[PDB]
Amino acid sequence: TALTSNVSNKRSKPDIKMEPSAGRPMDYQVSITVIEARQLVGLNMDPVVCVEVGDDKKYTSMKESTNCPYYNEYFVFDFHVSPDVMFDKIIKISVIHSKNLLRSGTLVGSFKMDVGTVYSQPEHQFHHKWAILSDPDDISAGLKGYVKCDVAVVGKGDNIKTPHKANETDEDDIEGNLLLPEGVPPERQWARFYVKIYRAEGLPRMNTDLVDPYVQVFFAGQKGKTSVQKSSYEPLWNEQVVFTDLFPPLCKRMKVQIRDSDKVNDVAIGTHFIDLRKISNDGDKGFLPTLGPAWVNMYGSTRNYTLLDEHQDLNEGLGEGVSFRARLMLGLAVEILDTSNPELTSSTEVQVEQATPVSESCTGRMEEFFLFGAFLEASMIDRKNGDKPITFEVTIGNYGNEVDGMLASVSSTPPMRPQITDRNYFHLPYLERKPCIYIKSWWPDQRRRLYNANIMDHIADKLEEGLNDVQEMIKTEKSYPERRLRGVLEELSCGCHRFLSLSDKDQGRSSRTRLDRERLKSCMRELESMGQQAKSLRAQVKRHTVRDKLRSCQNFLQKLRFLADEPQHSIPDVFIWMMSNNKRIAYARVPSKDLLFSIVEEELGKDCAKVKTLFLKLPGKRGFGSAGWTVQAKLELYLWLGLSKQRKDFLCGLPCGFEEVKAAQGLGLHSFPPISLVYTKKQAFQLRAHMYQARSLFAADSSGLSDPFARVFFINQSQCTEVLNETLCPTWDQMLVFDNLELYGEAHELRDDPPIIVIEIYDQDSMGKADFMGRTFAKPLVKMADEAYCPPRFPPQLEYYQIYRGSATAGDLLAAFELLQIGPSGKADLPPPIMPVPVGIRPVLSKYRVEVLFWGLRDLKRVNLAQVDRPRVDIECAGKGVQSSLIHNYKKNPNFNTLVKWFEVDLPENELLHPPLNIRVVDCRAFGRYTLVGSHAVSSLRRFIYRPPDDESMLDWWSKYFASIDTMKEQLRQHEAKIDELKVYPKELESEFDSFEDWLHTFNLLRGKTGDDEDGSTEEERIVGRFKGSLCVYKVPLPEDVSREAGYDPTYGMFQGIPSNDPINVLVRIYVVRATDLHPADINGKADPYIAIKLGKTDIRDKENYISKQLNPVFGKSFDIEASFPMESMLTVAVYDWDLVGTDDLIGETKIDLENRFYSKHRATCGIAQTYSIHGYNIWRDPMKPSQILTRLCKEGKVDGPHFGPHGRVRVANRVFTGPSEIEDENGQRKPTDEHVALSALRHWEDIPRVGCRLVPEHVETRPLLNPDKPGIEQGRLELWVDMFPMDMPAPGTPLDISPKYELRVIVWNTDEVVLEDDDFFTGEKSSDIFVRGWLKGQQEDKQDTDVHYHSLTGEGNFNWRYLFPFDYLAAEEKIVMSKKESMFSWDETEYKIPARLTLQIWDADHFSADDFLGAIELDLNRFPRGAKTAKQCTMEMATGEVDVPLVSIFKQKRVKGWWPLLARNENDEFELTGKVEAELHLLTAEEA
C-alpha cells in the first residue's frame, strides 16, 4: 500500500475565538404541523391538539366526534435564546377532549420530546411521524393513540430539504413511522428517576449575609424541591427527589440548582446541567443511567453581593459562569418499575423522601491539592480601566477568596500602575519581577476521571490537529493529502490502542463509584472498536474519496469529544480575575483537567507545566457584541495543579534562569512556594512583521469601504502600518520592527512554542476613535543566534491569517512574522522611514493582462433615494485599473456600448497568492463627484484564468410525461412499449448546467456597513444590484495558434465569438405542468392554487381559473407573454392562494433568470426533441427545423457543416451521425427528410471538438418554491419548463395541449339454466327467484337490480330491465377514473384508477332474509366475447381460455347483443355452468349522455 505522512506541514495559526457558541443567543425557529391523528382512545370525544413549546401553547381547531381527526394546521414558534436553553425546551404534543373556557378539558394523552432531540436528526426534522400519547396520570394505563405530525428545527443560516408530503392514499404503517429516534423501543416503559441530594459546601454570601438554601430539580417539565436548611453555609439535606417518566427519556437533560429561600425575592445560586446522554447507554450492551455519589461543581455570578446583579442570569445557568458558587453532592439511579404489578401506587407525581445517607469517604479521600501561578506578563489592558492600579486574583473553589473573607496563602498579585502601550491599550510593567500566587485546597482524590479524560482529549486533540492539517493541505493543494490522512488514522489507531493500557491500573480502590465502572468499560469498548475502525478507514481512504472519509473522521472526533467530557467533576475550574483597586473587571476560565500533573504524557494535562496565552474577557453579556471587542487583558500564565506530595518538579515548566523570592513564612524552607520571581537571564529578540496585503475586510464606513491599518501587539510594544484610504483589499507593503525586545528564559524553550502576536485591524476616521474590523493571531518563525537563515524554513514566505470580528469571519491577512535573536555580534548576525517587505518574502510578480467583458447592470437600487442614471464601472486590481464606458441611460438601455477593454497589472506568480479583483460601480455625474453605487470583492481569479488546450390515436402529452416519469423511476431504481419520451429533471435546470454561466458570470453587488448580529441587517438589505459580465486573466501572450483566439479584435479581447449586445424583443412561453407538496395557506389546512407570473413590467394572473382545495394541483396551462430583453429578463413564477373575502395570500415563488438561458451555448431557449415528427403528440413545437438548428450552431460554432449525402446521414465537423430517413404525417404516406439525422446530431453535440456543448432536451424542470414569510424552507415543488423565441425569427405555432368520459348502457333480457335454491312446497324439486344485479365501478354508486322472476323451475326468466353507468375513461391505459374521498376523515376529492371491467351477477330473492348468490362473470370492456344467438349456443368456451370464441371491444363495435355464461364454485371447488344470461352492451360518449 501507499505510505503515510507523519509530520505536520501546516497549522501554525492558532484558531482562538473570543465569541464561542456558548452563551451567545441566536435566532432559533421551531415549526410544528399536526397532520392527523389515529386510534385515539375515547368515547364521543372532541379532540383538539395542544402543542406547547416551553412557556407558551397553541391549540388547533376542535374536531367533532371522531377518533381519527385531520387538522394539517401549521404552527410557528420563534425564540431568540441561547442554543443550550433552546435544546432543553420541551415539546408537549397533546390531545384535549372537550376543551372550552368554562371548564377544564380532560387530557386523552400526551407526548414529550425536547428540541435538541429533533435537532439531532441528520437534517434536523422528523417527517410524517406518529407520536404515541402515553398517560401522564396513570402508569398502568395503555396506549392512548398516535398523532401524525412534522417537527422541524431550523436556525439562522440553516436550510432544510423537505421530503415528499404524501397523502393518506399512499397508505402508511403507524408502527414503522413513529415519532422516535433510532434504537428506542416503541413500547417505552415507565422508570423511576431518582436524584439523591446529600450535602452542599461553600455557599457565598447572599442575604446582605447568610444563606437559606434548598435544591429545585427540573426534569421533562416536572419539578420537585427539597427542604430549606435555614442559616447554613454548608447545608445538609439528605433528601432524594424521585421522578416517574418514560424510558428512555426524550428530554435528555436535568437541571439541578440551589435557590435562596428569600421570602420575597428567591433567586438561584448556581445551576448544573446533568447531560443525561453521557451517563447512559442504550440496548442490552448499555446500562441504566446512574451518577455518583460524587460532588459536582456549579458556577454563576460573582460571589461579592451586588443588589442590582447584572449577571443574575448566570446563576440560572444561561451562560458560561464566571466564578465558583457552590459544590453539591449528587447522585442518580434509574429503576424500571414493572407496571403489571398492582401493589405499586400508580401515581406519576414527583415525590420527596429521605435518602439513604452516605459517608464522605465514598466520594474519595480528602487529599490536599496545590495550585501554583505565575503571571509572566499582563498586556493589552483596556485604556478605560487603568487609571487606577490593577491586581490579579486567582481563585479555585472557595480557596483564594481571601479578599472577600469566605502556610498563609496568597491569591493576589501586588497592585501597580499600568504604562501606556498605545491609544487603546495599557500594559503592566512587570518586566523581570513576575508576581506569583500559591494556593492550598482540599478536594476528593478522584484524579482517575480527569486522567482518563486527559487521555481521551489527547487522542481527540491529535486527531483534530491532524484533520485540520489535512484540510489545510487540501486548501493549499500540497502533495498527497491521502498519505497525511493515512498517517493521522495510524496515529489515531495507536492512540486508541494506547488507552487500553493506561486507563486500567487502579481498579481496586474503594472510592470507585458505580458510574465510573460502567462508563470506563463503555469507553474501553468504544476505543477497542475504534482501534480497528480507524484501520478499516485507513484502507478505505484514497485520493479521490479523502473529502468523504474526512466526514467519518469528524464523526470519530465528535465521538471522542463526547467521550472526553467527565460528568462527575472532582476539582472545580480555576478562575483568573482582574480588579481595578478591588472592583472586578474581567475573568478567565481554565479547566482543572488540563492543569493536572502526572508522570506519563497522555494522562498529563495538556496545559500543565507550560505557559499558555490566555485572554480575559468581560463577564456575561458584556463579552458579546460591541462592548467587548477590545481585549481586556492578554496574559501568559504559568499554571500547575496536583498533589503536594507531587510538588517535586512544579517549577521546571517555567522559563529557566530566575531567582526565586519567597515570603517571610518560607525563610529557611527551600520547598516553600515563591511569592514572586525575579528573572536574571535577559534575552534580546526582534520581531519584523512583514505584511503585504489584507483582503476581503469588513466594511466600517458609510461608503462601504474602510480605512485599514493594523496594530501589532507583541509583549509590551505596539506599532502600526500606515493607513490606506477607501479599500477593503489594502496593499500595505510595510514591514514593522520591534527592536531590542526583552524576553525571559532560555533560547530553545520558545523555539517550538513561541509567544503570540495579536493583530487588530482598525478603520481610521476623521476624528475620535477608529472603528474595528476584527483581529487575528499569529505565532512567529523564531530563529536563534546560532542557527542559519537558510532554506527551507527561511526566509518566511507569506501566509493567510483568518481575521474574526468576534464571531463572523471578516477577512484574511497576508503576513510572515520572524523573531530574530540579537546575538554576540549584534545585528550583524541577522540578514536584512517606512521599509517595504524584503525580496524573497514578497511574491515575485509577473505581468497579467486582465480583460473584462462589460455586459450590463441589472436590478440597481437607489443611492440616497435617487435612481441610478449614469453608471460607470471602475475595476481595480493591485492598484492598476480600467474604467468602463458610461451608461448613457440606465432606464432605456442598461448596457455598455463597448464590450471589452483591458488593463495590464503585475500579479503574483502562484495563483493562491492572488489579491481579490475589485469591481465597483459608481454614479458618474459632472465635475468629478463619483459617489459609490456598489462593489464586489470576494472572488478567486483561477476560475477566470485561461489555460491553453492540448390503438395509438389516443396518445397525448400526458402519456409522454408518465412514460418519462416511469423512465425516471427505473433510472432511480437501477442506481439505488412504443411511446417516445423526454428528460424529466428532478432539480432546477441551473444545477445540471452550472446556472448557464458558461461565459455570462454574475457578480453580486454590495454597499454599506456589514451588519452586526443584532443591530445590523441581512445581505438582502445590502444588495444594491448585480453586474453581469466576464473576466479573462492571462500572462504574456502565447504562440500564434493560441493567440488566434484573440487576434482579430482588441475590442473583443479573448471573448471572440461572444454574441452581440443590442436589445432584442422575445416571447416567453411558460408551460406549467403540476405542483407537489404545497404549504397550507388557509385555516382548513389546504389552499387554492393559481398561477401568477411577473416579468419586468408585465404581471399576468389566472385567478379566474383557480383549482379549489388541492395541495397537489395539476395546472396544465400555457402563457404567451411579451418581454423586452434585457430589461424584462427577471422572471418569477409564483403560486397564489385564492381567497373568497379579504386578500389573496402568497403560497410561494421562485427566481428564474432567462438571460443566462438565452445567451448560453447550451441553447436553453428550446429543448431539442428525442425524435422528430410532424404530427401527433410527439409534434416538433419549435418553429425553426433541426436543419436550421445545426446551421445556427455551425455558424455560431465556427464549424463546417452541415453536409448531406443521402437523407439518412448528416456530417458536421469531423464526425458523421446517422438516423432514419423518412418522416410520417397524419395522412399515412412517406416522404424523405434530413431532420431526423440532424436532430441526432444535436443529441450528440458534446462530441464536437471545440465548442462541444450539452444542449438541453425537451424537459420538465422542477423548481423549489420559496416564501419571504418563511425563508430557507422548501415550500413546494413546482413542475414547469420555459420556452423562448425571438420575434425577428418567424413566429411559433399554437401552444401544445397539456391540459389535465363515457356511459355504458346494459339491458338484461332473459336468463336460462340457472342454479336453484328453494325447495318447492308441493312437488319438492328446487327452484329460484331469479333477478340480476350489476355494477361497473362499485356497489357504492353503481348498484342496480332488476325485477324478480319468481318460481323459475329451469332457469328461465324474463326481465327486460335497464342499467346506466356513467364513468370517466383513460383510453391509453384502459383505466376507469372516478373522484371520491379516501375515508370519512378526509376533506378533499382524490382521483383513483380501476381496471375497466363490468361485473354481472345472478341472485335469488327471499322475502324474509338476504339474497343468495348464484353466479358471476367479469367482462373486460375491450375483450368481452360476442354473445351467442341462442341460449343453447352458449358453451363453456365463452368464459374459459379457449380462443374459439371471438373477442369484441365495445369502443369499436358500440353495440353487442347475445348470450353469455356465468360461473361460480360448486361443492367440489370447481367453476361450473351456474347460469346464463341474455344481455346487450351499449356505449355512448359524455356528449351523447
CA 270, distance to chain mean position in Å, is 34
**Toward Ca ion, which CB reaches closer, 265 or 340?**
265
Alpha helices in 1018-1059 (DSSP H): 1040-1043
Selection from 297, 296, 278 nearest residue 286 by Cα: 278
Q: Minimum Å distance from CB 1262 to Ca ion?
A: 24
Site for Ca ion in 1068-1107 (CB under 5 A): 1081-1082, 1088
- CA-wise closest residue to 502 among 515, 514, 520: 520
d(CA 1187, CA 655): 84
841 vs 493: CA distance, rounded Å: 39
Q: Does 707 bind Ca ion (CB under 5 A)?
A: yes
Task: Tell the smallest beta-carbon distance from residue 211 to Ca ion (Å).
Answer: 6
Judged by CB under 5 A, the residue of 518, 869, 1412, 1480 near Ca ion is: 1412
Q: How many chain residues touch Ca ion (CB under 5 A)?
A: 22
Instruction: Let me know: does 37 contact 95? Beta carbons within 8 Å.
Output: yes
Minimum distance of Ca ion from residue 403's CB (angstroms):
23
Which residue of 506, 746, 765, 1373 would you call a contact of Ca ion, by CB under 5 A? 765
* DSSP β-ladder status, 812-821 and 781-783: parallel
Q: Which of 512, 503, 513, 520 is nearest to 563 (CA)?
A: 520
- Closest CB to Ca ion among residues 262, 1019: 262
Q: Give Cα separations from 252 to 29, 113, 123, 221, 276 (angstroms).
A: 20, 9, 19, 12, 5
* Binding segment (CB under 5 A) for Ca ion, from list 21-29, 264-272, 462-470, 695-703: 695-703
The 10 Å Cβ neighbour count of residue 83 is 18
**Pairing relationship of beta strands 390-396 and 574-580 according to DSSP bridges:** antiparallel
Q: What is the DSSP string of 624-652?
A: SGGGG-S-SEEEEEEEEEEEGGGGGGSST
Burial 531-542 (b: 16+ CB within 10 A, else e): bebbbebbeebe
**Where does this chain touch Ca ion (CB under 5 A) — which range of 573-581, 701-709, 834-842, 1280-1288?**
701-709
Nearer to Ca ion, 107 or 720 (CB): 720
Could you tell me the smallest distance in angstroms from the CB atom of residue 776 to Ca ion?
20
By C-beta, is 144 or 1079 nearer to Ca ion? 1079
Q: Which of residues 245-274 bind Ca ion (CB under 5 A)?
A: 260, 262
- Residue 808: CB minimum distance to Ca ion, A: 18
Angle, vertex CA 280, rays to CA 278 and CA 286, nearest 5: 135
CA distance 2 to 760: 44
Q: Cell 363495435: give the residue.
A: 1453
Q: Name which of residues 718 to 747 contact Ca ion (CB under 5 A).
A: none
Closer by beta carbon to Ca ion, 701 or else 1224: 701
Which residues, numbered 1294-1323, are part of the site for Ca ion (CB under 5 A)? 1317-1318
Interface of this chain with Ca ion, residues 873 to 932, rule: CB under 5 A: none
Minimum distance from residue 1009 beta carbon to Ca ion (Å)? 8
The span from the CA of 480 to the CA of 7, in Å, is 13
Q: Nearest approach, Cβ of 1144 to Ca ion (angstroms)?
A: 7
Nearer residue to Ca ion within complex by CB, 874 or 1411? 1411
Contacts with Ca ion in 1121-1160 (CB under 5 A)? 1137, 1139, 1145
- Position 1345 contacts Ca ion (CB under 5 A): no
Residues 1189-1228 contacting Ca ion, CB under 5 A: none
Radius of gyration over alpha carbons of the chain, in Å?
Answer: 41
Is the Cβ of residue 212 or residue 607 nearer to Ca ion in the bound state? 212
State the minimum distance, in angstroms, from the CB of residue 979 to Ca ion.
Answer: 38
Q: Give 472 or 763: the residue with its C-beta nearer to Ca ion.
A: 763
Candidate list 884, 1404, 1424, 1474; residue touching Ca ion; CB under 5 A:
1404
d(CA 27, CA 1020): 17
Minimum CB–partner distance for residue 725 and Ca ion (Å)? 8
Q: First vs last Cα of the chain: how many Å apart?
A: 79
CB of 342 to Ca ion, least distance (A): 45
Q: Which of residues 25-44 bind Ca ion (CB under 5 A)?
A: none
Grid coordinates given for 1381: 374521498
Q: Which three cell numbers, joined as nine digits, stand for 914?
A: 492572488
* Selected binder of Ca ion within 239, 607, 1329, 1388 (CB under 5 A): 1329
Q: What are phi and psi of 1167, to 5 degrees?
A: -75, 140
Q: Which of 247, 254, 29, 245 is nearest to 125 (CA)?
A: 29
User: Please, which residue, 235 or 623, has the CB nearer to Ca ion?
Assistant: 235
Among 168, 491, 771, 1153, binds Ca ion (CB under 5 A): 771
AA letter at 86: M
Taking alpha carbons only, the member of 1071, 1079, 1083 closest to residue 1111 is 1079
Dihedral sign, CA of 83, 85, 86, 88? Answer: positive
CB of 1412 to Ca ion, least distance (A): 5
**Closer residue to Ca ion, CB minimum distance, 417 or 769:** 769
* Cβ nearer to Ca ion, comparing 257 with 290: 257
- Smallest CA-to-CA distance from 1219 within 1255, 1171, 1178 is with 1171
Nearer to Ca ion, 665 or 1358 (CB): 1358
* 1388 interacts with Ca ion by CB under 5 A: no
Using rule CB under 5 A, residue 201 touches Ca ion: no
Stretch that binds Ca ion, among 308-316, 618-626, 768-776, 1367-1375 (CB under 5 A): 768-776
Residue closer to Ca ion by CB (options 115, 697) is 697
- Report the C-alpha gap between 1339 and 1398 in whole angstroms: 12
3-state secondary structure of 775: strand
Amino acid at 61: S
Residue 784 phi/psi, 5-degree rounding, is -105, -175
Q: Which is nearer to Ca ion, 374 or 700 (CB)?
A: 700
SS3 content of the chain, % helix, strand, coil (to 5): 15, 40, 45
Contact flag: residue 212 with Ca ion (CB under 5 A) = yes
Residues 632 to 691: which contact Ca ion by CB under 5 A? none
Shortest distance, position 1323 Cβ to Ca ion, whole Å: 16
Cβ-based nearer residue to Ca ion, 316 or 763: 763
- What character string, x for contact with Ca ion (CB under 5 A) and - otherwise, covers 301-330? ------------------------------
Give the binding range for Ca ion (CB under 5 A) out of 396-404, 756-764, 1286-1294, 1441-1449. 756-764
Type of residue found at 815: A
Sign of CA dihedral 1342, 1347, 1353, 1357: negative
Q: Residues before each break in the chain (C–N > 2.5 Å)?
A: 208, 406, 832, 950, 976, 1300
CB of 473 to Ca ion, least distance (A): 38
Query: Which of 349, 726, 1247, 1406 contacts Ca ion by CB under 5 A?
Result: 1406
Preceding omega of 83 cis (within 30 degrees of 0): no
**What does the block give as the cell for 1056?**
471572440
**Residue closest to Ca ion (Cβ):** 1329
Residue 701 as a binder of Ca ion (CB under 5 A): the answer is yes
Judged by CB under 5 A, the stretch of 469-477, 488-496, 1030-1038, 1402-1410 that binds Ca ion is: 1402-1410
- Residues numbered 1012-1051 forming contacts with Ca ion, rule: CB under 5 A: none
Q: Between residues 491 and 707, which has the closer beta carbon with respect to Ca ion?
A: 707
Q: 1200 or 1389, CB closer to Ca ion?
A: 1389
Report, in Å, the least distance between residue 1016 CB and Ca ion. Answer: 15
Give the C-alpha separation, 467 to 470, whole Å: 5
Question: Interface with Ca ion by CB under 5 A: which residues?
Answer: 207, 212, 260, 262, 700-701, 707, 763, 765, 771, 1081-1082, 1088, 1137, 1139, 1145, 1317-1318, 1329, 1404, 1406, 1412
